[PDB]
Ligand SMILES: [Ca+2]
């Protein structure tokens with residue numbers, strides 16, 4: 095009894111001291127927490143990165159004191175003083191748990207619905223890695239993914255997407271305990287809804303009866319072919335009434351001793367280490383790849399591999415759409431990165447995200463390609479879970495417009511400092527007839543405003559490969575790779591220019607003579623800028639052309655490099671088939687921009703580019719206007 099009550103009142107006491115947060119949810123889930131963590135959860139406080147630990151996700155991240163209490167009591171590096179600093183500036187206990195900051199936190203939750211989607215990704219990674227690595231009974235990948243979620247989570251559409259897909263893929267090691275704390279706007283029959291996803295459902299569990307919860311979890315674990323949801327019905331004075339009379343933050347040694355998990359955790363990891371040694375004796379190359387990939391490290395020869403492939407891409411000098419350049423880059427990277435896991439939100443023939451060796455993940459088998467269905471938000475938040483798990487490097491594609499359907503998952507990846515790769519195709523009015531509901535205008539500009547996010551808009555096959563390789567190399571941030579539907583002309587480059595692509599912007603065509611201005615262009619508009627430079631030169635007006643595949647990356651280059659690309663006092667003109675307003679950061683009040691700030695139109699692409707002023711004459715006149 096007191097083992098649940100200590101969680102209950104540690105939470106209430108820390109919330110009270112902070113005078114911020116909600117104490118009811120952690121208090122209602124204390125028996126659920128006690129049951130899962132003392133009877134089932136396999137974890138080692140001495141090594142929060144133990145490869146085969148069970149993964150726990152508190153999807154209703156507002157109940158954060160529940161998780162902080164559990165980490166403290168079981169012996170993680172989180173102290174009473176840390177709990178006394180709940181929600182205080184720079185404390186180890188922010189109001190929502192933060193991955194990478196606090197040992198034992200598996201994901202950053204707060205925005206509702208995404209936690210269960212993260213967990214689906216973690217369970218998917220376990221399934222994928224188990225199919226790939228486990229061999230003749232040596233099951234080095236074998237752990238569960240447990241989730242606590244609440245009513246807010248279940249109302250959100252992203253929970254529908256993630257749990258629907260989890261049902262189709264038969265994720266039997268995903269086990270959800272739902273805090274059903276209800277007796278107007280929420281009347282769903284949750285057991286019936288989750289039956290319709292193909293889940294195993296344990297309804298009507300007494301959420302304060304540890305015997306009932308343990309039996310339900312046992313039933314969930316036995317259902318190996320379906321994810322499970324367990325519907326847990328939950329409900330100073332209350333303190334001594336519930337039998338907890340210790341003052342705030344006082345915990346007796348006997349209760350710390352009963353809760354401590356270091357002895358059991360150590361024996362767990364030692365037992366796994368013995369299994370991995372048997373595995374390493376029989377499968378040493380696989381064993382070494384498992385460690386590399388779980389450690390989230392790239393192959394030692396990655397850069398030399400990419401450099402060789404880039405030289406070959408240049409030898410081909412293909413004029414293709416960069417969505418095809420993307421598929422070519424994926425092929426190149428996949429040879430080198432066995433951890434690569436692709437997918438698309440029902441746009442595989444459009445995003446061009448499969449490669450020659452992609453194997454679709456199914457209910458019965460592993461693979462390296464996920465058909466997410468028409469579920470962009472689910473895809474983004476599932477990819478966050480895939481990358482948090484370790485062992486795989488996911489990418490997932492949709493049309494650039496539908497970045498808006500998964501927008502907060504993109505932001506949460508950046509906040510968590512993780513490195514999923516978000517792929518987007520059909521990036522401008524250049525997509526043509528599908529019209530203004532699909533034609534991006536402002537999306538690329540808005541994506542650039544996400545802190546700790548790299549946005550790449552490569553102009554040809556060479557920039558596309560560099561963008562992919564840089565996205566794959568980045569250790570602590572995500573990337574958006576933005577690709578065109580229409581063919582883009584390959585640009586010739588020196589060896590130095592090729593090597594400067596990774597600096598985000600570079601001079602792709604210097605002026606013949608002293609530059610009178612600089613044209614900054616990205617993606618599909620570089621060719622237009624180069625053509626305008628030639629027309630201007632024929633009029634005796636010398637300008638330089640700068641390709642800026644990533645503003646994000648250019649902005650963190652040293653000042654000398656940025657000045658070498660964009661010299662002070664040289665008028666700047668930006669050309670991009672999107673909203674103009676972000677370019678004033680570069681061109682200022684006396685520069686200019688060739689862009690589009692209104693909605694698109696349903697028509698062939700060539701006509702739209704002409705109608706909206708993406709023409710040589712307009713770029714030339716605009717350049718002249720700032721001289
Ligand atoms: Ca909730």
Ligand SMILES: [Ca+2]
Pocket residue numbers: 245275276
């Ligand atoms: Ca409720």
Ligand SMILES: [Ca+2]
Pocket residue numbers: 695
């Ligand atoms: Ca119209």
